[PDB]
């Protein structure tokens, strides 16, 4: 992708590989290969939970970016 070539010339790479079988890991976690991140969009609403509806963001520890 031309973008990656332009990006690599600045020192930036978008590589983000997880060493685990099946599972994704989070950006900045030790053992990941690459200096990038991949993101996605999840909006979901549930009642009685929201996190387990549709895209499963499992039993995860999240930290907030703002």
């Amino acid at each position: 992708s031309e973008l990656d070539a332009k990006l690599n010339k600045l020192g930036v790479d978008r590589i983000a590989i997880s060493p685990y079988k099946q599972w994704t890991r989070g950006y900045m976690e030790p053992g990941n290969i690459g200096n990038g991140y991949v993101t996605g969009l999840k909006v979901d609403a549930g009642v009685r939970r929201a996190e387990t509806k549709n895209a499963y963001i499992g039993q995860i520890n999240m930290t907030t970016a703002s």
């Binding site: 997880s18 994704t24 989070g26 999840k42 963001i57």
Partner: protein
């Protein structure tokens, strides 16, 4: 928030769904430098994430149990009491959350932005809610277009998505908006190897979603609008 020089978005940059190509803009608000910024429903991109992580009953590349995923996230919880009327100050009849990702024109110089918001809804009128949300969509579309001037970021599209639940009496609603920053497992890249990292991303950058499902032997959870938010 932001995804910038180091990032890709599931469903747009990688594993792009043909719906991203099918998609007609809802309308285009004029962003400051003169460009018309098309606004699109992000339900393609949203469907793409569900495809990659899977669902609680058909779990695919979900984040590892106990991991630390940094997320751009907001979320609101509200209760509806058993039939009470002038209800307590943190209660309502419905709840909603929203997200918008806007792709920067030049990702080598400027970053792409996420807008996330969520709130509670006071009236019991579901039809009122829905209209307020289209109103709020149109609102976010504008703040983006405006606030980009301040850092002189120019975008090329914004993809906005919403999700909502009305509570029945004596039920609590939770609504969340989250964008996770993750790294991808090898048994997710057909032809991928822990030894070929950079090509691995290129594989995912080139496979479309339907191609990826076939290659992995996974049933398209998007199907034809199988997923409701």
């Amino acid at each position: 928030x932001f995804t910038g020089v180091q990032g890709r978005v599931i469903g747009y940059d990688i594993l792009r769904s043909p719906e991203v190509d099918k998609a007609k803009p809802l309308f285009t608000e004029t962003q400051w430098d003169g460009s018309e910024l098309p606004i699109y429903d992000a339900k393609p991109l949203q469907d793409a994430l569900v495809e990659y992580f899977g669902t609680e009953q058909d779990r695919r590349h979900y984040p590892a149990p106990g991991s630390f995923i940094v997320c751009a996230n907001k979320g609101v919880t509200a209760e509806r009491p058993k039939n009470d009327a002038d209800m307590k100050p943190g209660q309502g009849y419905g709840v909603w959350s929203a997200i918008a990702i806007s792709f920067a024109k030049d990702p080598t110089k400027d970053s792409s932005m996420f807008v996330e918001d969520a709130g509670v809804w006071e009236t019991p009128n579901e039809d009122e809610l829905l209209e307020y949300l289209e109103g709020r969509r149109k609102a976010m579309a504008k703040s983006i277009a405006e606030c980009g001037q301040d850092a002189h970021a120019s975008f090329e599209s914004s993809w906005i998505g919403f999700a909502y639940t009305m509570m029945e009496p004596g039920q609590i609603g939770n609504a969340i908006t989250v964008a996770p920053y993750v790294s991808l497992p090898i048994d997710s890249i057909p032809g991928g190897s822990i030894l070929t990292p950079d090509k691995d991303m290129e594989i995912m950058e080139n496979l479309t979603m339907p191609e990826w499902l076939e290659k992995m032997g996974y049933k398209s959870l998007s199907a034809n609008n199988a997923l409701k938010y």
